[PDB]
Amino acid sequence: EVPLPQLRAYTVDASWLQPMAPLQIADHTWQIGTEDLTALLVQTPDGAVLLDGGMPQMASHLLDNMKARGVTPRDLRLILLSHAHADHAGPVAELKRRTGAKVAANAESAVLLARGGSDDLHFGDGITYPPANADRIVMDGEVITVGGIVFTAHFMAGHTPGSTAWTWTDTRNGKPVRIAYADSLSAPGYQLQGNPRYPHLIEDYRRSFATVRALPCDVLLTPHPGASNWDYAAGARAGAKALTCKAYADAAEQKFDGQLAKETAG
Amino acid sequence: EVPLPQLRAYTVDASWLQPMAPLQIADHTWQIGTEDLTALLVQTPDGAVLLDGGMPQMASHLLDNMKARGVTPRDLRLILLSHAHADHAGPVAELKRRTGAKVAANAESAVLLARGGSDDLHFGDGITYPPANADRIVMDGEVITVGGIVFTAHFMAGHTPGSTAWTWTDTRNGKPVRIAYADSLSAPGYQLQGNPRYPHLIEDYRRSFATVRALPCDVLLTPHPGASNWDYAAGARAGAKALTCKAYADAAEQKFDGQLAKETAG
Amino acid sequence: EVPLPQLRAYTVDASWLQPMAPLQIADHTWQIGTEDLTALLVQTPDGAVLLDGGMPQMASHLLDNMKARGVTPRDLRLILLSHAHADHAGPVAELKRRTGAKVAANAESAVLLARGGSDDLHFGDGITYPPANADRIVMDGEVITVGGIVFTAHFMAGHTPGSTAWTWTDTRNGKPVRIAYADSLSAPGYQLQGNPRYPHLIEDYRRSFATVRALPCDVLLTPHPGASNWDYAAGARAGAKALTCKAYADAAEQKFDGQLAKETAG
Amino acid sequence: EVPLPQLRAYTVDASWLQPMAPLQIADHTWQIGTEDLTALLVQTPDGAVLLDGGMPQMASHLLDNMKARGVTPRDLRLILLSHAHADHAGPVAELKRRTGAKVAANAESAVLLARGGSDDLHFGDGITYPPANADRIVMDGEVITVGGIVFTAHFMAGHTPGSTAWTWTDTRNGKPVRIAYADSLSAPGYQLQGNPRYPHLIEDYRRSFATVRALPCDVLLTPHPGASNWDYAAGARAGAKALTCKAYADAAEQKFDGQLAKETAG
Numbered sequence A, B, C, D: 001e002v003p004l005p006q007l008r009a010y011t012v013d014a015s016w017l018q019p020m021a022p023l024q025i026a027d028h029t030w031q032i033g034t035e036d037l038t039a040l041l042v043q044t045p046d047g048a049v050l051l052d053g054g055m056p057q058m059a060s061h062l063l064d065n066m067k068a069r070g071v072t073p074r075d076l077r078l079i080l081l082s083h084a085h086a087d088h089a090g091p092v093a094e095l096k097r098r099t100g101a102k103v104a105a106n107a108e109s110a111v112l113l114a115r116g117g118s119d120d121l122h123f124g125d126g127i128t129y130p131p132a133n134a135d136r137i138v139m140d141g142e143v144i145t146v147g148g149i150v151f152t153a154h155f156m157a158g159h160t161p162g163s164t165a166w167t168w169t170d171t172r173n174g175k176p177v178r179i180a181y182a183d184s185l186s187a188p189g190y191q192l193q194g195n196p197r198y199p200h201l202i203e204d205y206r207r208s209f210a211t212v213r214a215l216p217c218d219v220l221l222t223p224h225p226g227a228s229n230w231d232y233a234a235g236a237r238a239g240a241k242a243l244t245c246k247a248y249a250d251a252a253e254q255k256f257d258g259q260l261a262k263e264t265a266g
């Protein structure tokens, strides 16, 4: 009669998979992912840090861009994550096998990473990737220091329980630049109200909007560059139109309120 | 010359290890641990639930008390935890091997349980126990239903990041009894202010005092019975002097404020 | 220019995904998977055992067939595996979440299962599935007893390091039937000689042919029924043409020797 | 009445905990553990390798000896293990947190390491330590290359399922020296015959004696130096009386045969 359906691959817009050369954000901070997925390399005298890696198939491209920047596999010391979905943490397991890197994450992100995104609160097993283990668990507001660049974790639960903003201070034209890599604030297809798998979902998003609004934030970056109005293909003007953290949080809250109203009506 | 020190066993007051026969709390709820460590058995037509197990060496005693209650190893379906320290989650791994039980816990408790209490935020590796894996991850306010007894998780971070209160409604003398198993609110030897491993420790405790104060709570129980003024050796009056959740939270907050003042002075 | 390739779903022949009603093998043993993937249910008075589950998307179908047999989710006690590839262990994680079942496996299978088939010795990350944890680790020749049905593990490394044959004795028409569920002995696209990830691959296959040849084996079943000449769609004659364990081992060794010769020539 | 017993710490002879300064074995190989527990540091231009760490409380001493040798925490790249018992893998988790090191191990050792030595086939939970995760799984005969020093794994199951000998070639006085770090071949208090948790124990030991006998072995070292007649406190003559691999294997087999005979008589 009728067989069960074939497994469906997690397919994405081509621009999410379009390689780009490294794009400099500040003196030691570079975008090294694809046109439409952020993966940030921060280079110190004491090794390099990667914040996100994008999709599972991006590992070799990331390593090629690291090499172009002078970062060998032994020089990658630390991987940090915005959240542990397949389009941001996809290549983490492979990167750990191929480099010196260790992963630091909060408990919620660590648990999701260790199950490869399976049993997701909203997606089930629809979007999985190779599992990886965290080497260090961080708490809210904890700092991690690499070569005198201090990264601070700001938990902003909602998009996932373990969603995190990472902040650090780099320099540009001699002057300090407070960089905020704020996680996604979307809720794509989520049941927001009365969700048995996430009962306090709405309260957590509301707190997260407030957290993002208050981040130290001369420059905002986001896992999907379009969410913060970055255009990584625009060269010297890639960041010209970027939102402030305040504007990003307000836009996300307006969208969220509209989604709540539509859910009540549906 | 001088060898490194021998490993130090986690030794406890004898009353924490003193077996007791099952003590009935409500129609389907029993204390089955030791004189000074709580381990609650809730019996349903659809299997039994255990909330905490005490110290690592308590597994056989727990199984003996379960048998006395008519609960065979196959009948134990679920283990819930207040927090994943050795004196409350100690025998979980062994219980999983010897029974049908699966563990449900929040992400923070799951991560700590899976490392057997090692790399504790405050105790380091001083207090470890056999590691165990969680089978289900719960979110704040999520319910788990076993035989029509509905258990609700109320996160109350502080004592550990993953500290949880569990509430359910049983009956006694025909009437509903709202039981609150509230976690520890102590901070034994903790650095409270400016702790790099737990930057928001104070805010989390303060929120947790408020959470405990508001629990549905006709009867309060706690992992250390003395914290809620239970005396499990007092028979028909074991619960007579028990605190309300409001009184427990107020006493814990007063103690916490005193500890903060002493830390500033030290 | 040219984006990175999209992820490729693990797609299989339709017959591997074609549901079938339960097919009785012996008094307490049933095939409950699909036309072309084995999943064996053994029913005891003390709960049920499942040997393999097939593809990830088969979980609900398996539970439906279990219900048809009188096995509720609480009644499934144990899951055993031939090997931890996606087409045999695919739905294990989901089955553990939805039933009482615990997994017993050898260390090699447990490690591969816990990474969801990622970093496979031969397939890399090409064929992954939701990760799961084993609850009990077994050694070669160890027995597991459920309701007086004794299952014996016979390690037969090669297809995977952790490949296992499981044997047990059921009855049929009053008489004992020694059932052998022997794992795959294929090496699909494998580098056999001088493989740096599996240096003793050839010796292990040769030992495994000998192990299979000697199993107690009135009835042979295999994860892919065609490998043992079963036809699960043939009804009362589904097993009529089945190979002996001796014939299965000889055919596998002949094929393996041909593959070695072709590898030397390529 | 009578409380349950207190947990018993894993206590050892003082010499196992007696720190020593680094002792040179060959041009790039040093003993850096204690008088009576081996922990080998191999120094390359491309980072350092540690084979075993001894007891849990040895981590800081190991790091101090690494510093004395010019190896900073970032320079430690790889940890290899003989077997995953507390007196050899004890400080692995802590070393991973404090250095750049990643662990490579076979599946059996990885599973035991990840449960911190709990549920041991012979010791139960009597001898546990902080759990750690392996970063790479190795197969029998696989090589790992660090700075042109090639380490080969030779599985020698028995003492634990995952027991491994590691071999490599260093130099001394200009000439190549084939170093064999062979695991323990003891069976302390083990049930050897008919052990349900290890049915093929005897066959595995017998194969392991043969494996050790045949290792490339100009210099033999063992996790307990006394097993190979090393005296790490004897300075320039520490290795003078060391056994060959052939002599070590023969002595272990003679002892094993005596233990079998005594078990039959008991």
Ligand SMILES: C[C@@H]1[C@H]([C@H](C(=O)O)[C@@H](C)O)N=C(C(=O)O)[C@H]1S[C@@H]1CN[C@H](C(=O)Nc2cccc(C(=O)O)c2)C1
Binding pocket: A085, A086, A087, A127, A184, A185, A186, A188, A223, A224, A226, A227
């Ligand atoms: C579903 C996405 C995907 C998944 C995840 O991570 O959850 C992942 C598992 O696949 N990652 C997401 C995230 O926030 O990280 C979500 S959100 C994504 C970003 N941006 C797209 C978009 O919908 N753009 C749009 C459409 C119409 C008008 C306008 C305008 O210009 O106003 C913009 C969609």
Ligand SMILES: C[C@@H]1[C@H]([C@H](C(=O)O)[C@@H](C)O)N=C(C(=O)O)[C@H]1S[C@@H]1CN[C@H](C(=O)Nc2cccc(C(=O)O)c2)C1
Binding pocket: B085, B086, B087, B127, B184, B185, B186, B188, B223, B224, B226, B227
């Ligand atoms: C250190 C304890 C131990 C550890 C843990 O879990 O962290 C575990 C790892 O060991 N579990 C604790 C917890 O809260 O769960 C802490 S707190 C414990 C309970 N009650 C004791 C107590 O100090 N009593 C006392 C003393 C003087 C006067 C009075 C009075 O009557 O006012 C009372 C101490």
Ligand SMILES: C[C@@H]1[C@H]([C@H](C(=O)O)[C@@H](C)O)N=C(C(=O)O)[C@H]1S[C@@H]1CN[C@H](C(=O)Nc2cccc(C(=O)O)c2)C1
Binding pocket: C085, C086, C087, C127, C184, C185, C186, C188, C223, C224, C226, C227
């Ligand atoms: C690649 C398969 C798949 C993977 C795995 O598990 O490794 C999984 C990850 O996808 N599972 C396999 C296994 O042995 O478990 C391998 S082998 C499969 C069975 N049977 C097919 C077959 O090739 N049949 C054939 C063709 C021509 C003539 C004749 C004849 O009649 O002689 C038969 C192929």
Ligand SMILES: C[C@@H]1[C@H]([C@H](C(=O)O)[C@@H](C)O)N=C(C(=O)O)[C@H]1S[C@@H]1CN[C@H](C(=O)Nc2cccc(C(=O)O)c2)C1
Binding pocket: D085, D086, D087, D127, D184, D185, D186, D188, D223, D224, D226, D227
């Ligand atoms: C129990 C030990 C301990 C445990 C382990 O790892 O399993 C660990 C968990 O604690 N590690 C061991 C191992 O082989 O790795 C075993 S064996 C240890 C070495 N050497 C001692 C010895 O008994 N010596 C002796 C006595 C009398 C005469 C003579 C003579 O000179 O002939 C020698 C004992």
Ligand SMILES: [Zn+2]
Binding pocket: A027, A028
């Ligand atoms: Zn600079």
Ligand SMILES: [Zn+2]
Binding pocket: A083, A085, A159, A184
């Ligand atoms: Zn996402």
Ligand SMILES: [Zn+2]
Binding pocket: A085, A087, A088, A184, A223, A224
């Ligand atoms: Zn995304």
Ligand SMILES: [Zn+2]
Binding pocket: B027, B028
């Ligand atoms: Zn009742």
Ligand SMILES: [Zn+2]
Binding pocket: B083, B085, B159, B184
């Ligand atoms: Zn505690």
Ligand SMILES: [Zn+2]
Binding pocket: B085, B087, B088, B184, B223, B224
């Ligand atoms: Zn306690």
Ligand SMILES: [Zn+2]
Binding pocket: C027, C028
């Ligand atoms: Zn019958």
Ligand SMILES: [Zn+2]
Binding pocket: C083, C085, C159, C184
């Ligand atoms: Zn396979």
Ligand SMILES: [Zn+2]
Binding pocket: C085, C087, C088, C184, C223, C224
């Ligand atoms: Zn297959």
Ligand SMILES: [Zn+2]
Binding pocket: D027, D028
């Ligand atoms: Zn040299």
Ligand SMILES: [Zn+2]
Binding pocket: D083, D085, D159, D184
């Ligand atoms: Zn040992």
Ligand SMILES: [Zn+2]
Binding pocket: D085, D087, D088, D184, D223, D224
């Ligand atoms: Zn030892």
